[model samples]
Target: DMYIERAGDITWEKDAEVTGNSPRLDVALDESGDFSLVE
Candidate 1:
């Protein structure tokens, strides 16, 4: 078995929930090399 391992950041926007403003998230690869929230 094989898989990809990467180290980078991802930013995206989502619909507002209350403030009517789009929020961006800074994501990074976890130990499994999968995307997850930086916070």
Candidate 2:
């Protein structure tokens, strides 16, 4: 399974304010190494 998660304590104070079907910063790593985010 892929490792995906919210910004958490390592993120900005406003990071949690993001709203949408998918929002803010999400971090993950795989064979190619992917870091995806949605505004």
Candidate 3:
């Protein structure tokens, strides 16, 4: 199987309420090299 990658600033909402918003410049690896961004 191939790998997936994500790059760039990463921002996400983690939780059921999803009230709090978290901002991260980087995140964990997801099989490939890449990053997630919101905005």
Candidate 4:
């Protein structure tokens, strides 16, 4: 939750128009298991 809160550089995607906000429907992680939002 802290990561989400500190996310100042946010972005929008295809679902933004449907959901009204850029809800993160999916997330991906790197080799080290560090992940972030997909939308």
Candidate 5:
């Protein structure tokens, strides 16, 4: 295995419009291979 670090320049952008009252979603990751999602 190897070690890695986050340089603090991590980010993103997203935009979407829902015609109906549908649910939203999002996902993210960190330097430690961790993740989170919204649904």
Candidate 6:
């Protein structure tokens, strides 16, 4: 296996929201994986 560092940035604290009330849904990684949430 290769050694990947967080190799770059920090991940989301956890499930983020884009709609209204938060759900038990999941999140994803984007091309700009350099923030708190999705883009």
- The most accurate candidate by lDDT is 1
Clashes of 6: 0
Model 3 CA lDDT for position 5: 83
Tell me how many clashing residue pairs each candidate has.
0, 0, 8, 0, 0, 0
Writing each residue's lDDT as its tens digit, candidate 2 over 4-31 gives: 7776666458556776596456656667
| Global CA lDDT computed for model 4 | 0.69
**Regarding lDDT, does 2 or 6 come out ahead?**
2
User: Worst ten-residue run, lDDT, model 5?
Assistant: 9-18
Model 3: CA > 4 A from native: 1-18, 30-39
lDDT of 2 at 16: 61
- lDDT per residue (tens digit) for residues 1-39 in model 3: 999788866766565364667756555555567655535
Clash pairs for candidate 3: 4-32, 5-33, 5-34, 6-33, 6-34, 6-35, 7-34, 7-35
In candidate 6, stretches whose alpha carbon ends up further than 4 angstroms from where it belongs are 1-25, 34-39
Which model is ahead, 1 or 6, in terms of lDDT? Answer: 1
What are the models' TM-scores? 0.27, 0.18, 0.17, 0.31, 0.28, 0.20
Q: Which lDDT tens digits does candidate 5 get at residues 1-39?
A: 999987885556356454677656697888899878945
Clashing pairs in 1: none
Pairs clashing in candidate 6? none
Task: Quote the lDDT for 16 in model 4.
Answer: 61
Q: Tell me the tens digit of each residue's lDDT in model 6 across 1-39.
A: 787655665777577775767556456766887434343
lDDT for 12 in candidate 4 is 59
Q: After superposition, which runs of candidate 4 have C-alpha atoms over 4 Å from their true positions?
A: 1-24
Give candidate 1 regions above 4 Å deviation: 1-22, 30-33
Q: Rank the candidates by lDDT, best first.
A: 1, 5, 4, 2, 3, 6
RMSD to the hidden true structure, all candidates: 12.0, 12.5, 13.8, 11.8, 10.7, 12.5
Give the runs in model 5 whose Cα sits over 4 Å from its true position.
1-24
